[PDB]
Structure 1
């Protein structure tokens, strides 16, 4: 905009580009997301204006939503680094378990809050989980298709990552439930632990089949109603479930039991954020500070 000095380009969000910007007046540094276009939705700007009130310590504060000149801007509090970068930076040594646990715990608190307020994230991934020097981690870039919608792309040819997508979405479910966020977070939890993406699919079917190869092809026994889902084909290959200890070694049994509950096929059996917070894995949770190189 005119009231900002784009310092650098933070990246390519989910509907537009994101910049680190400095408010020419308050001097405050913010993250500015630009969005696309022959009018702009009205229902969107409202479901967006609802996010401004969604303030929580584990949710990136949305400062302002400015709609002008066919473009839509979202002004967010600026965080130092994203989890994707931090994980890559910690690839040789691995993120210490107490920090992995603290991050998982805080993200579940943030989700418990969003979900208790009927807001779903829908597109959780390391790139939109932001961390600071103080040990906090926050949910960002809520993709609420309940806002501008869930288009085919951001705004200009950019590959959408499917690695964290819940199976019910891949199977064509029309209505998402809060369970889709627990699934994505379970995938992120495993990735922090193992230092490798859990289900790195390169297409919707490959994503689906990678999940099936690891957790077993789902059926009516473990997931009632699955065979009646929109994109379910009786012709799907039938893989047996893999021993779970093979999935996230060397995570301890408390972590593995919580992960298995976050990855249940049936969205109704999948653990809620609220219950997850009570899991024994968090009995000794603490809040370590990360070693951040900014």
Structure 2
């Protein structure tokens, strides 16, 4: 077994490097992002993911700057970072390992001609909304919400948002690129080429993930923006002049046994008007998640549900009175 020893800087806290040794290094992902590895830390025995990207000499890495300041139970944790080396330098992000993704779990169910039990749809969606409530409180927009970027530990039912390669602090009056976000999950303002969009593009993407988990397939597919806009229009109806300036019965969209609270939540996330969409914190508070607030709720495997109510002042800052719903009496 090959052991690699590096001098890495801890993610959170002041810049004080340490020797870090890891082994059992294997490639687990390859794409436009770069390469993701799996490895075992020699000291603790803990599994880690290592995202390796090409580092520009000219500037500081935006993903690293964002990740160093994030601390949330539903966001993948940056343990360390280090630089490595023809004649080019790479930035390596040592993250907490999470074994599965919502993409892979949902695909197991789709191929088996079935849908993910609604208890999981609530757990995953609720935890995704918490992660968005947290990043959005600092003005940070993920800009790439999709099932592959939603990590899962299937045994504990914990969801962790990953991939901050497109994330950016959105400042009012500053223009932003419209070519971020993956096909199927782009908000209609991004399809229309808006550069003045807000963090609500993340809420639309999350609404696309929710509808997909309920349906067993993407709600707005299409290989072009015009095809995707046709699928959006089939469900939401034709956008008014006011709606276009700002950027079908929903019950007939899903299978008959679909909970009406789930359908009501989709209609409030998937709206043409960016300001009409729910905020992540308001989505957390929706009646679709009431089952998670029940003191007797348990996972299908018999275990207790993960931490769902440990809200901080920062997390609640968008609407502090929502704490009366969000933190139930038993919590």
Pairwise TM-score range, normalised by the shorter structure: 0.7 to 0.9
How many residue pairs align between the two structures?
A: 267
* Structure 1 residue 13: Cα displacement: 5.0
Structure-2-length-normalised TM-score:
0.72
Structure-1-length-normalised TM-score:
0.80
* Structure 1 residue 172: Cα displacement: 1.1
Q: Does 1:82 align with 2:93?
A: no
What does residue 168 of structure 2 align with?
146
* Structure 1 residue 244: Cα displacement: 1.1
Could you list the runs of 5+ residues in structure 1 that have no partner in the other structure? 154-159, 227-241
What does residue 57 of structure 2 align with?
39
Q: C-alpha deviations, 1:130-168, integer Å up to 9, x for none? A: 111101111111233539x97979xxxxxx841111111
* Structure 1 residue 248: Cα displacement: 2.3
User: How far apart, CA to CA, are the structure 1 residues paired with 2:245 and 2:298?
Assistant: 39
What does residue 229 of structure 1 align with?
none
Higher relative contact order (CA 8 A, sep 6+): 1
> Secondary structure, in 3 states, of the residue corresponding to 2:151?
strand
* Structure 1 residue 217: Cα displacement: 3.2
Q: Does 1:288 align with 2:295?
A: no
Contact 2:103 2:147 in 1 (8 A): yes
**Cα gap change, 1:73 to 1:177, in 2 (>3 Å):** same
User: How far apart, CA to CA, are the structure 1 residues paired with 2:219 and 2:259?
Assistant: 17
Q: Does 1:244 align with 2:265?
A: no
Correspondent of 1:168 among 189, 201, 211: 189
> Secondary structure, in 3 states, of the residue corresponding to 2:291?
coil
| RMSD (CA atoms) | 2.8
Q: C-alpha deviations, 1:166-186, integer Å up to 9, x for none? A: 111111111342201111111
User: How far apart, CA to CA, are the structure 1 residues paired with 2:38 and 2:178?
Assistant: 25
Q: How does 1:232-271 map to 2 (within 5 A)?
A: 242-250=248-256, 251-271=258-278
* Structure 1 residue 22: Cα displacement: 2.6
